[PDB]
């Protein structure tokens, strides 16, 4: 395949190319070229910070404790993974992204506190 | 609350707003503006590198194996967490920061080596 080769593939199939996409995020006139590189770095770091905040700091794929709400475009399970591409999915739930992210942050802080308490039990 | 809303709160109470603060670290004339952004990125990375070095790479809160020395401003336990703010605490132990950081780095390298040996036991 190669970079974005999986863009037209189903969401399930495309889950096998996350490595490929991840590597291509990093790999006066001149000042505007320099500005663009700096902004690209800041963007990269923001995505990494969210993964860190959500408790998914070193994974391309991870699980969380936030249940999927049926209100968030319930489109079955197999229909999403086998008969839809990621480009379509990103529109199906575009109005829920901020809700989901907020939930992911909250159901991390709750976990860190529980872990901290357990480490204090002699 | 919001960004720095917890600054006047006790250290204990303020531990619940770490997420808020973390997100606001990332979120010729023009060249000096560009320079400032670059330096902000380097600062951010230095803090992340220390967390990585200390074995606390993806957590807002983590525990270590370094004991607290009573010489490091022993101010009880409940007094620190309930009747002090983080701004005050940062002055109470400002002369011990480098000592603590050095200890945190050493009591990581010792742990990585022990883990490495255990993974070689058939």
């Amino acid at each position, epitope marked *: 395949l190669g970079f974005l080769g999986a863009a037209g593939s189903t969401m399930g199939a495309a889950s096998m190319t996350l490595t490929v996409q991840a590597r291509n995020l990093l790999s006066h006139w001149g000042i505007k070229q320099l500005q663009a590189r700096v902004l690209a770095v800041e963007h990269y770091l923001r995505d990494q910070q969210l993964l860190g905040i959500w408790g998914c700091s070193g994974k391309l794929i991870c699980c969380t404790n936030v249940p999927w709400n049926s209100s968030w475009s319930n489109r079955n399970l197999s229909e999403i993974w086998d008969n839809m591409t990621w480009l379509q999915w990103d529109k199906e739930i575009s109005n829920y992204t901020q809700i989901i992210y907020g939930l992911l942050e909250e159901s991390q802080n*709750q976990q860190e*506190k*529980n872990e*901290q*308490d*357990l*480490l*204090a*039990l*002699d | 609350l919001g960004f720095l809303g917890a600054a006047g709160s006790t250290m*204990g109470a303020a*531990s619940m707003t770490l997420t808020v603060q973390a997100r606001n670290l990332l979120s010729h004339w023009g060249i000096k503006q560009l320079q400032a952004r670059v330096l902000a990125v380097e600062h951010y990375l230095r803090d992340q590198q220390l967390l990585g070095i200390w074995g606390c790479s993806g957590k807002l809160i983590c525990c270590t194996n370094v004991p607290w020395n009573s010489s490091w401003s022993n101010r009880n*336990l*409940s007094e620190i*967490w*309930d009747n002090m703010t983080w701004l005050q605490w940062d002055k109470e132990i400002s002369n011990y920061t480098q000592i603590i950081y050095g200890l945190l780095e050493e009591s990581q390298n010792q742990q990585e080596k022990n883990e490495q040996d255990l993974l070689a036991l058939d």
Partner: antibody
């Protein structure tokens, strides 16, 4: 004045269920871990369950592990215990108590400071 | 369970000792052994915690100690008002959390 006041209880058939509750005041409810302690008629004291102050961590004695639920509502200042699949061996006074584990920032206790008077449960 | 054997007694004004024997790892490793005063039909009162501490509201009469795998409660000069069952309990390593001892009766 710290008070823990239990309610609920009564006689239930073996194989049945019931729920106990405890209201509390005189202290910040949300600042303390709580537990239920069993006083069987002639045994005096048995630990049953422990819940932390945020209501997220629960621990049980093995004998009730698959049957009892310990829960909290910090807006109501209420502790509660749901007991399922009751046995005759569970006949006891069940006491509401504050203590046990703590927040890890505040001098963990590992003992009980306050007791209610307890609900009587017969099975 | 921990064992506090029956029974302990003495005349008013005499000191008495109430024992509590554990096993190996429970009260041997954890300095979280408490004592309670249990009245016949009332909720128990905390007397001793950790090893040697007592809460406000508890008089000087009650003190205690631990050695090896055995703990004890000492009453420095017994009152008739102390006719209660005594119970010891201790932290159990996050496995069983707390172990209560069989209690023992004090007669004055």
């Amino acid at each position: 004045e710290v008070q823990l006041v239990e309610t609920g209880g009564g006689l239930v058939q073996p194989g049945g269920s019931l729920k106990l509750s405890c209201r509390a005041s005189g202290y910040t409810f949300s600042s303390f871990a709580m537990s239920w302690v069993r006083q069987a008629p002639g045994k005096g004291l048995e630990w049953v369950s422990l819940i932390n102050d945020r209501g997220g961590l629960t621990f049980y004695v093995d004998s009730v592990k698959g049957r009892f639920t310990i829960s909290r509502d910090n807006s109501k200042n209420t502790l509660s215990l749901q007991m399922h699949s009751l046995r005759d061996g569970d006949t006891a006074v069940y006491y509401c108590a504050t203590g046990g584990m703590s927040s890890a920032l505040q001098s963990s206790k590992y003992y009980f400071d306050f007791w209610g008077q307890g609900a009587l449960v017969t099975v | 369970a921990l064992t506090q054997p029956p029974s302990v007694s003495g005349s008013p004004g005499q000191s008495v000792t109430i024992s509590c024997t554990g096993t190996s790892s429970d009260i041997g490793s954890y300095n979280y052994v408490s004592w309670y005063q249990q009245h016949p039909g009332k909720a128990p009162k905390l007397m001793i915690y950790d090893v040697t501490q007592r809460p406000s509201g508890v008089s000087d009469r009650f003190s205690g100690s631990k050695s090896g795998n055995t703990a004890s409660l000492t009453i420095s000069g017994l009152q008739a008002d102390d006719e209660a069952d005594y119970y010891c309990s201790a932290y159990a390593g996050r496995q069983t959390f707390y172990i209560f001892g069989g209690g023992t009766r004090l007669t004055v």
